[PDB]
Symmetry: C6
Subunit: 288 residues, 6 copies
Amino acid sequence: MIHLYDAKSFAKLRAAQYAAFHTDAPGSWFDHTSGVLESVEDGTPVLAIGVESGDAIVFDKNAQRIVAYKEKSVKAEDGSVSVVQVENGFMKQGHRGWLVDLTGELVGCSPVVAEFGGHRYASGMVIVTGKGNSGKTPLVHALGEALGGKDKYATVRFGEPLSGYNTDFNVFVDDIARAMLQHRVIVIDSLKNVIISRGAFDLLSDIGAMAASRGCVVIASLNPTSNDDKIVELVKEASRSNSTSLVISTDVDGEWQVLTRTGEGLQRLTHTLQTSYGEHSVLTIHTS
Amino acid sequence: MIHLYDAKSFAKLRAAQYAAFHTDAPGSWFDHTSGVLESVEDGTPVLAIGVESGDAIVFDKNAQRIVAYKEKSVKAEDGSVSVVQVENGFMKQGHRGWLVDLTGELVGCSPVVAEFGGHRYASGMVIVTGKGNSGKTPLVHALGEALGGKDKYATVRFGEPLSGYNTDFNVFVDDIARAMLQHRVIVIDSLKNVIISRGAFDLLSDIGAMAASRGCVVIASLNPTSNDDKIVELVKEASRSNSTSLVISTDVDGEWQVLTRTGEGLQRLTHTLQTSYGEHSVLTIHTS
Amino acid sequence: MIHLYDAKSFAKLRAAQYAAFHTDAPGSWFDHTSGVLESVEDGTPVLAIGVESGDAIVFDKNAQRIVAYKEKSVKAEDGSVSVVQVENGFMKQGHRGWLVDLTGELVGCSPVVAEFGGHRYASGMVIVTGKGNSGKTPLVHALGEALGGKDKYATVRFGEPLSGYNTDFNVFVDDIARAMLQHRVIVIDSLKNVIISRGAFDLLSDIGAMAASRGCVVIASLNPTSNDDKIVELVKEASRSNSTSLVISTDVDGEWQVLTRTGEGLQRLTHTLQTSYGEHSVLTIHTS
Amino acid sequence: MIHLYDAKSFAKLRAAQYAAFHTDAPGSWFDHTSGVLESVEDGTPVLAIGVESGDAIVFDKNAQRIVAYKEKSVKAEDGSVSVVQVENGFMKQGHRGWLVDLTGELVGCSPVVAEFGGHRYASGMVIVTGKGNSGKTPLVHALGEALGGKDKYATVRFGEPLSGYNTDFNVFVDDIARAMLQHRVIVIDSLKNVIISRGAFDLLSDIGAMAASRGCVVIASLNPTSNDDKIVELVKEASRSNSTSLVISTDVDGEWQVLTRTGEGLQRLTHTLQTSYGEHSVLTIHTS
Amino acid sequence: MIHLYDAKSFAKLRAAQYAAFHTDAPGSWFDHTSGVLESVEDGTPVLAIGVESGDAIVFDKNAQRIVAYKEKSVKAEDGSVSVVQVENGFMKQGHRGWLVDLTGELVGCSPVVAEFGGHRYASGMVIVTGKGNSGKTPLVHALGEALGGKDKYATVRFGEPLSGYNTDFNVFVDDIARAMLQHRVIVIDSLKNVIISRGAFDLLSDIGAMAASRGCVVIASLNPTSNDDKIVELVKEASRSNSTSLVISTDVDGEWQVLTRTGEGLQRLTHTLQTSYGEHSVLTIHTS
Amino acid sequence: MIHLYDAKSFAKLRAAQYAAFHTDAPGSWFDHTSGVLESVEDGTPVLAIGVESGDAIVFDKNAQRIVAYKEKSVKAEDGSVSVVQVENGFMKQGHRGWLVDLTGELVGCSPVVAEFGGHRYASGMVIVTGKGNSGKTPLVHALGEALGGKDKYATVRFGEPLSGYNTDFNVFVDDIARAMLQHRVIVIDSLKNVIISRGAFDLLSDIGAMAASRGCVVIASLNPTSNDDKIVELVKEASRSNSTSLVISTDVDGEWQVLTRTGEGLQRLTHTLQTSYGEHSVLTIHTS
Ligand SMILES: Nc1ncnc2c1ncn2[C@@H]1O[C@H](COP(=O)(O)OP(=O)(O)O)[C@@H](O)[C@H]1O
Ligand SMILES: Nc1ncnc2c1ncn2[C@@H]1O[C@H](COP(=O)(O)OP(=O)(O)O)[C@@H](O)[C@H]1O
Ligand SMILES: Nc1ncnc2c1ncn2[C@@H]1O[C@H](COP(=O)(O)OP(=O)(O)O)[C@@H](O)[C@H]1O
Ligand SMILES: Nc1ncnc2c1ncn2[C@@H]1O[C@H](COP(=O)(O)OP(=O)(O)O)[C@@H](O)[C@H]1O
Ligand SMILES: Nc1ncnc2c1ncn2[C@@H]1O[C@H](COP(=O)(O)OP(=O)(O)O)[C@@H](O)[C@H]1O
Ligand SMILES: Nc1ncnc2c1ncn2[C@@H]1O[C@H](COP(=O)(O)OP(=O)(O)O)[C@@H](O)[C@H]1O
Ligand SMILES: [Mg+2]
Ligand SMILES: [Mg+2]
Ligand SMILES: [Mg+2]
Ligand SMILES: [Mg+2]
Ligand SMILES: [Mg+2]
Ligand SMILES: [Mg+2]
């Protein structure tokens, strides 16, 4: 909804956004939204995401699809009304994104999702890209494991000519939706087939905000299939724009640069990652 | 409608347009249109704005959507007829923009919305853009607070991968419509996802005129996601064209240039803004 | 319709076309067509113009829209048949343009619309363009007043982010239609939003001929929002092509060049205009 | 239909095609096809041409439109079947072009349409183009009068911002159809608005063959509104391709070059035209 | 259908494909397929070809169109099923191309269609192109007569502004279908209007295979209307790709180069042709 | 579906993926999936592939098309549901690709399909491309025979102007589907007509994953019809991206480079192939 501010309430907002990344316990936002989701009335639509055509499918708190749901409205503090209606498996009324409020007044954050190697990482979408045909796949997996920490990370596979890989966009958004509804750390191996259909365009536009609001973090590989020219600059550009954080390869083997948006109007941070391969190409990110 | 003029009535018009920016009390036009709006017959359609498809949704004076409204015509002094009809939540007959006359004979103005730091600022749409990845967000907020003055400013969030950010275009125009119907100072953080769908194109084309007629002022961030080439010149160009005022970054840190259209065929003005950051990236615009 | 000629009747035609610009009393064609229009059977469709979709709306002699009109045919001298039919507010059968004959055998003229400062000006469409972000607006208004002479000129406002400006294309063509049906001198401030929809393309293609046939003159501002490169050459080009007359800015402040098509296959004329600003940006065109 | 040949019948065909341009009396083919048309059963569809949408309207021998015609088939010598069916004013079955056979075995000709100034001119389509903004209009008219000889030439006006000019494509094809059904010499002033809609594309593709088959000759002005660059080379190119003859301006004032296709696989001829202006821009083509 | 091979059966296939061009009696494949076609059950669909829309029309062995045909399936050795169904004049089920098997296991051939001047020529599609505005027409005709040998060749005329020339794409494919069903040597004068509609694209993609399977040879003129730049290289490229054989003009007057694909994975051959003009532009290809 | 991992289960996965290419017996995966397929309930949909329109057709284990299949759902370990429904010959519900699980937890492999000349070759899709108009056809066949080893390889022919070649995209996917359901080694001669329709785009996106999952290997020829410029770099690029393995021609006659993806995030391997022609263009790949 819309929010009103004067100097004083704006300064409080910024302080809270700053704390959401810098001082809140890592993964606390995720635990908080998981709590909000489980308190959702059984059967209530909680998430809507676009499929290939541009239409949207809807899920409940247990990541089960909703196919029929009689129109229901909700009045916000803003005075604005929220309406949701599902019919024949598709949203008849509503909007893409979260259908229940996970944030309230606290918006514009990049909730800390985890801490590793002396650095805090933001929830939201992280695109791993850069100098083509490098080791993006091993990197998204190492990041997944490291950010997972005590927990397992979820892997969404899509659009690679390898065994067991789904290449149908509608199965892909179904996996993404389930992943965000159930896990704090998600890896998407290849946003290749995505970047264009309306559903695909919808995804690039919505995923970061959906993850950041949940407090989960989606680590997506984007190997520029495009030339190995300066088209990689445009890819990086498009990526910076729809990503909460960016991870780009450098001219130094095994080294990557992490660029993080810490919150609305807040400072962008950067740190470097050193990595190395073990057996069977398992990559390890060096810490101390 | 159309207006007729001879030398004498034209000179009077220009004098009045000149006064609307230069000598009228800041925010007086807004107060006046608020008065016109509240005297509108209950239930009367007052504003129509386009959604993603190109269709338009309609609101009443209290920023509540109208879904059903039997056809109604109105004869203007011009002899032209205005017809409005809403059905199934969409305008069946009418036009995008204000559906009740807020201006009358007094058109082509950039009604002073506020005065700050020795400068008068126009109502209408203000696009904040320029040299990519700068501090556009902190700037739109500081401008919002400063122009708000004694009042709070309204913030419309859209299309950024941060918590609580709507990324659905139809929710976006709903937020904009409510904002203009209810507040004199409005901030839109990111016209990114907009600049293309018909609704988006409609918005760029309509928003400035809608705001200027209301006397409100919409301060919109436009971070060129495009290259950091001379595509920024085209962005600036597109922005100049659909903006009442333009605010662009310069080669000097914290400095911005404000270019203002003071009214139809009137002189374009320019002044500079100096700014600095405080705690939690709160930006302050220097005055004296 | 089609016309047949041998050397003799062709020489007569050219003489008459030459007289229509050079020797007929200024504005006499307009008065003549006004006469033809008022002698039109009440309720008869007299003008059809395209709306955004490409469909056309129809007006009667009093500039009132026709929504229902049973099919009616008319046999021309040519042997060709003219059919008009309106249904549900849209032309079911007919063509864009004048639906009653205002010219007869006398076609291919640029009927003198007025004389000012020692020069005769043609009816039809006049596009004021050139070296971007100049004083096009003040110029179209000064030209409007000057060509109006004893009469007031009609102003059609469209697509500018200023108070009271319509930005809906369908209201725009409605204003244009009323303007041409009722006034000899018309000013269109900004063909910006137009130059693309089918309605818009229809307008560029039809307006000049409609005005020339009526004997009215439409003075349209066209500020190339495009680069300030040599794209202005293409704009000028597109403008020359659909304009009866062109008015372009020069490298000399306040100076403009007027290029006029005096009629079918006749000589194109050129003269220069000197102008200066007064109070509140009112522009004056120097004469003697 | 298709035709079979061996060396002997092919040599006869070429001889006949050669005679159709070089030795047949000028305009004899036209008189012959007029005879074929008048012997057509009353009400029989004789010509189909495409309108803007790509659909086709159909005419009878008197240039009257057919709106209803029950399906009718015809078996050709080729074994191929020709079917025509009109419904609701549009061809339901058939093809664009002549619906009755005007040629028989004699195809691939450029039937001499007239002789003037010591040169024979082909029927078919003649595009007058070249070095932009020249005197194309005066030239098509002089050619019209000269080729008309003892007869008057027909003028089809279209898409110029001048009085009485139709700018609706569907009225345009109606004029062209009537013109070819009734006159040997036709002038089209401006193929501008045409060169793109399907109807327009259909016209460029069909007009030459339709005229050549009738033995009439359409002299069409094509002023490249495009740049005055080497885009004129592409225009000329597109023109050469769909024209039976080309008439292009040269670097010498009043001089034009005529390039003629004399028939299928036959020699292309070229000759030059000298012209000069008289009173009221009437152009005269010098002969002896 | 699909075919299985091991080293031995593959070597046999290549030997047979080699023989189909190099040692089989010229035109023997055509005679063989003519035999297969005449043994087809009366009324059986034998050929399907696409019309402008992308839909397909169907013919029987006598080149008569089929408009109604109840669904019928056929099981191949491959296990694959072939289904054909015609309704309302269009294929409801089936595929473009031959609907009865003319080849069996013997596929990937360029069956010798004729021998002339010491060279064997392949069946399939032959595109005659190169250095624009040359003598492509005279060449396709001389080739048609020479390859015809004892038989007449069939001429399909299309898209040229000359008398009797069809310019409707749907009549064109009807002519092509009949030609291939009935003659071993076919000339198409101008693939101009074709190279784009779906039917046209279908034709470029299907014609070579259809002809090669029949054993007939289609000699098509392709005059690049495009620039006379190096766009001719792209034309040649597109032509090489969809042609069984290519015939291109050279820098030497009257000389042409013939490039032939002799079969699947077999050697491409080249030889030169010398030609000269006789009376009425009849071209003769020199032999001994 | 999605998979969860911690460091330990991820290391096991990589080990198993490494074994799937490096140590499993060649062709063992194919035999395994053949087993899974034959244990599939009779009539069960096992494969869905897209046709030209973008819709998908469905096959059973015996490569027979399914036209009617009442909706059936399946709950995965993931919690995700799989639904399949066929109606009127098209998938009403489901996804493109394998409809029964052939992989389970073991995904992201490039199952060894065969071993020849001291090298192991991956299943999945292999595109043979490079320096235009070379010997791609002979190469795909030699590779087919060699990888077939003791078995015959299946050949799918498409879009070449040669006898017996299908050029209809829908017959093409039917052949591909049957080939993958029934053979371990498949050759597709020409992906030309493919690289664009939605079906075609679907194929490029799906084929590699389908083959890799089955453990079969599709050897597809891709002769860049495009320029012989550096467009071949883009072709190679697009090819690398959707291929499990790439085979490219080099500057050395008869030599080719094989680039293999050995599995998810695993090392890409490269080796060289030397070849030579025998009688009738049969190509032999040198081993020892
Ligand atoms: N042990 C290793 N040492 C060096 N490079 C490796 C090792 N293991 C894997 N790689 C690289 O990791 C990448 C494999 O994952 P893949 O997804 O195909 O790459 P990409 O990130 O280019 O899309 C390849 O570029 C491969 O060469
Ligand atoms: N205290 C600060 N000092 C300097 N720069 C800051 C400070 N705080 C925030 N910024 C800058 O403000 C911007 C953050 O807002 P954001 O919307 O992401 O930027 P942008 O205007 O480029 O779209 C970043 O470019 C960030 O680096
Ligand atoms: N008194 C004046 N002296 C010089 N320039 C003026 C004066 N008044 C107005 N202008 C110029 O007239 C133009 C205002 O009308 P506007 O429609 O916005 O311009 P444009 O023709 O570029 O589209 C501006 O470019 C403005 O700077
Ligand atoms: N008497 C004349 N002397 C020289 N030029 C003339 C004369 N009369 C007309 N013209 C030229 O003929 C042309 C007028 O016809 P028009 O259709 O507008 O031209 P175009 O062929 O460029 O499209 C103009 O270019 C005009 O300047
Ligand atoms: N006797 C001849 N001598 C030289 N050239 C000739 C002769 N007869 C015809 N031609 C050429 O043959 C061609 C005519 O056929 P056409 O189809 O129009 O040509 P194109 O192959 O360029 O499309 C022309 O280029 C013409 O100049
Ligand atoms: N014996 C041979 N010696 C050299 N080249 C050969 C031999 N046999 C066939 N070729 C080449 O193999 C190719 C034939 O197969 P084709 O599919 O048409 O080629 P491409 O791979 O270019 O698409 C041709 O380029 C041909 O010249
Ligand atoms: Mg990857
Ligand atoms: Mg911003
Ligand atoms: Mg202006
Ligand atoms: Mg002209
Ligand atoms: Mg030709
Ligand atoms: Mg090949």
